[PDB]
Symmetry: C3
Subunit: 128 residues, 3 copies
Amino acid sequence: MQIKIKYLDETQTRINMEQGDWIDLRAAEDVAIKKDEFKLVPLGVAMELPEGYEAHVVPRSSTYKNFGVIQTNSMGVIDESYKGDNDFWFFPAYALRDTKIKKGDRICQFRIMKKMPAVDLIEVDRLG
Amino acid sequence: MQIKIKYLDETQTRINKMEQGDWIDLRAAEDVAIKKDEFKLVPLGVAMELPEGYEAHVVPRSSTYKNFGVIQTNSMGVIDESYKGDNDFWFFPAYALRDTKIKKGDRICQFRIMKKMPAVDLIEVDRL
Amino acid sequence: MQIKIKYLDETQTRINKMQGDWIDLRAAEDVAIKKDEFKLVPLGVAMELPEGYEAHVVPRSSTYKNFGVIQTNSMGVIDESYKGDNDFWFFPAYALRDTKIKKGDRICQFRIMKKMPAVDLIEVDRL
Ligand SMILES: O=c1ccn([C@H]2C[C@H](O)[C@@H](COP(=O)(O)NP(=O)(O)OP(=O)(O)O)O2)c(=O)[nH]1
Ligand SMILES: O=c1ccn([C@H]2C[C@H](O)[C@@H](COP(=O)(O)NP(=O)(O)OP(=O)(O)O)O2)c(=O)[nH]1
Ligand SMILES: O=c1ccn([C@H]2C[C@H](O)[C@@H](COP(=O)(O)NP(=O)(O)OP(=O)(O)O)O2)c(=O)[nH]1
Ligand SMILES: [Mg+2]
């Protein structure tokens, strides 16, 4: 199973695994964020995911410790269909304190996972 | 694979975007106003009987923070197959980072289903 | 399918068997957190998961109203790799109000999941 991945540019740090571990993604540019402010931290990457698969994106264990940001959407769902040449991943960050992220910083991690199977949604007037 | 769904009332907007594999959006069952640093359970006006052996996972949409200034306090909501009774309506536990207003009908979060953990024996052991 | 689990001390309340359900985990000691402050809440447990699996840890839906805390990493990911006698799970809590969590309190919950299959990251210039 392969993932095709476009980098924003040559300065981005490429990421190498087939170990099953979640893969760290990194900030594409310096972002500074005041306490109680919001910013998209661009991750400088676009990917074509395997057919029938999602990416899930959550912070790293140490993200809060080292940057004082929480992830606004809790968990990011990157769908297989987000595979365009301008479809760059971002990390939506709310700073609970003054913070600076530097280009290259590892700020979140992801894995892939089979989309849910197909499903008939059937309205009913009463449940058991 | 089918899910039964019951709606609080005819007012509610059927979520008739059954899966092409994608997560599915849920909507505020009523007008809800939440002030800065206030918490509210936002009712989603749906009860469901998930497939045997499954659970549902709920998370915010990508734009939920931009548009309503709320985060989901439980990060990823877990809904077990057993939450299927006739009064088991889904909610969105929302904490507000600014003064905000959700209107009835609004898409505020999204779900998919996924198979439960297989059974597991838990052994206590002195060391590892 | 088997998980080997090691409690911190005798004091800790062992957990029941279960069925596929997320298992609740308990705070290992009383912890007080002021508004707008962060603290790791020990869950007094370390575990050897199955070869090829990870654990996901998230709050109960009631953690906020009962205890006033969110989990700053959203969902903790614990790898098969974290299986040593000192590898004790924690709940990273940030308090949005003053709060005292009390030993024994069930504050978050977990399950296991097969890890991602092996994949190739093939760099490309266009998509
Ligand atoms: O944390 C995230 C979350 C989403 N994303 C990406 C994936 C998503 O496809 C895109 C946002 O554009 P839309 O809001 O239109 N996508 P959406 O999730 O709304 O898809 P849909 O409308 O199909 O439900 O941002 C991230 O990069 N990081
Ligand atoms: O975001 C959510 C999360 C859960 N739920 C529902 C489904 C689930 O069966 C029920 C309880 O979930 P939790 O286990 O996370 N909270 P708690 O453990 O307090 O409830 P219970 O004691 O029933 O397990 O609430 C929601 O409607 N929205
Ligand atoms: O909420 C959490 C999250 C992680 N953990 C555990 C598992 C993890 O291995 C450990 C943190 O160690 P590291 O800082 O080395 N992070 P991790 O092992 O995930 O990094 P890598 O991606 O290199 O494995 O804490 C918790 O107890 N609670
Ligand atoms: Mg529970």
